[PDB]
Amino acid sequence: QCFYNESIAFFYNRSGKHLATEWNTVSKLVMGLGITVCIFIMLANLLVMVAIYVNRRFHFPIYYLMANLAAADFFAGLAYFYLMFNTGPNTRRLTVSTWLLRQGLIDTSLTASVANLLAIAIERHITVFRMQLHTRMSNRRVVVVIVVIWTMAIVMGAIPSVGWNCICDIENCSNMAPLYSCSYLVFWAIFNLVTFVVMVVLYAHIFGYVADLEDNWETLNDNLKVIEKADNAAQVKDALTKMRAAALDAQKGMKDFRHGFDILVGQIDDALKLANEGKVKEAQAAAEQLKTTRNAYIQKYLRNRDTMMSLLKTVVIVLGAFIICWTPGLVLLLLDCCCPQCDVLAYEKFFLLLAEFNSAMNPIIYSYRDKEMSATFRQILG
């Protein structure tokens, strides 16, 4: 059993897994649809990689990482192509080395996109707290990051092919993968799922902080209109106190522009002192100067955050579609070794195609969300 010259039939018969010898009707259609999707992945992801390369506006650290994510899908397109060519009756034709090759290329392609989306999540976590994009130094650093992403992918796709397999542990073989160990699949599934959880936490921290700044901006704009209305001294004090409390929460999270927002805190504090004396008209005039102060930075930060959030939402849709399709397949791996006889793993072909379509979904997402990229795709074709 331990590295014997045994066929794939030896491993597939021992575990509760089917192996075909004849050309089945569904095997021809799953191969037919499989190749058709693979060719589209190798064309749609190649089109967006050329689009970032020729367009001047897409020469930024965030867009270079998107091209690497497309390159990971392009590699996945080649990985699933070799898989569909060796499915059904052609599965029996595979040797011990070639089985680990098709299974290895798929494991490499997943962690290539997993580490890419992880790097994009870190990229967005820095740029939001740094307001705008970085210099040329980060573009040289991105090349180093791309190396780390692909190195991690090659290593993760080699770990089961470098001793961690049930070849010399034939009793601990999984029902889904007859050459892969159950201890590896439990580790592999919990590794990719914990990465999805920490990635959700990263964007939740971004959206939460943006919502905290937007509600503070809402409190600063609504209470400013209350002072504009001719009212008593007590009404002016209540509106200024709410603006001061919102401003202190706004300056709470290196590049720091806190010396710009603290000026407004001082202007409100000086306006609050005028209201305490009894001067209502002077307090209303001082609060009117605060309106011209916020209308000066509305073109420097409030007009640039809309372009940032438009690209941020696009990234979350790419990550969202990735979780929704890959999680049922990874949960299936957990139910394979930790759920024996509770339920049959019949929905195996469905979850495989569900994850395959995601590699084609990414250029489709950038086509209707990004305005500049949509016009660039037509320029390459013509």
Ligand SMILES: COc1cc([C@@H](O)[C@H](COc2ccc(C3(C(=O)O)CC3)cc2)OC2Cc3ccccc3C2)cc(OC)c1C
């Ligand atoms: C190491 O973890 C795995 C294991 C597999 C495969 O060995 C099995 C083996 O199951 C297969 C299911 C269908 C066929 C096909 C057939 O019709 O026979 C379409 C070719 C082949 C193998 O797929 C399962 C279904 C799935 C989906 C998404 C994510 C994980 C899994 C586990 C695929 C895979 O990526 C797709 C990962 C990440």
